[PDB]
Each structure stands twice: as C-alpha cells, then as structure tokens.
Amino acid sequence: QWCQPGYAYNPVLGICTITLSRIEHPGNYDY
C-alpha cells in the first residue's frame, strides 16, 4: 500500500492515513 508524504498505511482502515508526526513533531521533520 503505497502511501503519500505525511501519511502512513492503515491496515485497520484499508488505506493510508495522516500520521501523528504531521501534527506537532518538529524533530521528526525538523529539516
């Protein structure tokens, strides 16, 4: 299941969903 940036495959829903990292995680995507 290919997922787009800021999203992550969701084997519980059937598609990709926004990851919590997108919310507030400067360290995750500090760049």
Side-chain angles (χ1 to χ4, degrees), residues 2-31:
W2 183 90
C3 298
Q4 358 185 53
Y7 282 69
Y9 176 47
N10 214 86
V12 189
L13 141 61
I15 54 149
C16 311
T17 61
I18 197 159
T19 155
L20 276 64
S21 62
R22 174 149 283 186
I23 298 169
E24 291 175 349
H25 307 262
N28 183 320
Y29 70 103
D30 184 353
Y31 170 75

